[PDB]
Design a protein around this ligand. Sequence first.
Ligand SMILES: [Cl-]
Lengths: 313, 313
Amino acid sequence: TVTEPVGSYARAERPQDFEGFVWRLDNDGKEALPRNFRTSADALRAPEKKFHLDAAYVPSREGMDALHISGSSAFTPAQLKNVAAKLREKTAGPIYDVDLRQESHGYLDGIPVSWYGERDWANLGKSQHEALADERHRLHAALHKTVYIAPLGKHKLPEGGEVRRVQKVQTEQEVAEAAGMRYFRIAATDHVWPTPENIDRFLAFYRTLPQDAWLHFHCEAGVGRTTAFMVMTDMLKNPSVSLKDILYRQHEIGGFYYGEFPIKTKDKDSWKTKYYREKIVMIEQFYRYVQENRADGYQTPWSVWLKSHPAKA
Amino acid sequence: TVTEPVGSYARAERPQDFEGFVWRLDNDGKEALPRNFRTSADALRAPEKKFHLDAAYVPSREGMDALHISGSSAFTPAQLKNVAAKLREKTAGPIYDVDLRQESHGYLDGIPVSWYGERDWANLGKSQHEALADERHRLHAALHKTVYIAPLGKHKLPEGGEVRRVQKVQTEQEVAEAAGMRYFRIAATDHVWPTPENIDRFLAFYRTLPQDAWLHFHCEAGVGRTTAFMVMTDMLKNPSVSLKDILYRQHEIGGFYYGEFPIKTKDKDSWKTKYYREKIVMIEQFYRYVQENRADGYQTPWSVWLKSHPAKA
Ligand SMILES: [Cl-]
């Protein structure tokens, strides 16, 4: 008997030790666009040294012009409108804001905030139904109330910020709609591999998208979760492309590199190491799922297939 | 028709603009004693330069050795124990912890904390009854909950701090009684002159004290409110001492100077200026009250007398 299979390590952590305690500022709104903004039409760049990749390697771009995806960090409502306008210049299909944040978030007087718990795990362990209910209740309770919104500084703790009596509350769905984007939420936990339920949900959603749909993925910082779903999308839509090519190109347009690399972590961040290794293994396992289930049109859900073909550390 | 008389300027401020937003750390517990600790038996020191006083002036100490009062900043439970043991060496009478804080405060896992709003006015405008009810409710609601406790830093906003799930909650009353001290609460608003009700309450309390009672006054910092009541007590108990000597001596044992001086605040603190001036005028008005009503045994209280003898700017 195995208590938690590879891919579900986070289930072993105790939600009660990471409860939310502050409204974290998700973006100061100073730039025109959110951070790490990138699209599948972008030129590839030299790889980051930390990943020890082959700078001489030239990844195939097969399928990228038709991929129609982008990624970024969280944003203010104005920044999202700039994103939507830029994307509208690349397509005539519907543009989706794919919100990958399990953490409860929204907009207080137009300011993008999130209910932050240690490691950003305030909704760890909650079903998507429970996470969205927490977010709705929490946002609604902020209206007409005095709140403290602050960015994190020294050691993931509030630093400075501001106090205000909220006069307007909005969900991301409303902000997305106000920007001309369709909205789709996948409540993925920060820093770890998306769960079987997150991916099953994504896959069912992907199946019914119109051909010209454009997917704009985003999390809080736009690196981990955002690149994982960009990679999954690239694998699903371009199954003939090699794993190496998918991983290099998604990294070289500005995303994370999801292949093996020398993991290094500050002492205070040593807890992340096993999550990074798990992600490497699960990326490979998902590629395998795509290669072995595409011919019959994915009759078998990812969650079911994963349980019959467990990943190995 | 005057909207607010001198001595009640604070009533013009709007409570809704200073609502509490964070559990402020009241003392880091690093020292054996609370800050600004001082007793009426202490030697007089040179006056602080900012008050532009006469360093060569030697105030009369008449009655100081029998005064039996002390003052300090807020404290951890251990620090209070140290205070109590130290005061027990000076008397055989009851030792009172006289809590002058209107702001809701208490102890979380033994940590002295307060519900802080801008200017420390989270309870501005509440009656003492409502202030104490808010306090009891907020303390109890913290039990078994995740809370954020932080010291204020730059701009009087949270800086660093800690997060924990509270396993113990106590009011200051419990902490005082466990330290072997009697407890008396006067809900005085931070930074301003105490209200006619705060003072009527103190004088009725003073009237019930056995002659050997020792009064240990304290607020958050141990300066404004603490010194005001120390002065009032000095005036009540030593009515033949000149106003100048009371003011010089309460300052020279380590308290605030409540006489006239060239008020110079930082631009961010200019709101303080009129409250300082108001304090200087009320100090004098309270002294008149004592001089005019002590001979008949205070048949008429301060609030009443004040209304028929209004202070003037
Ligand atoms: Cl779910």
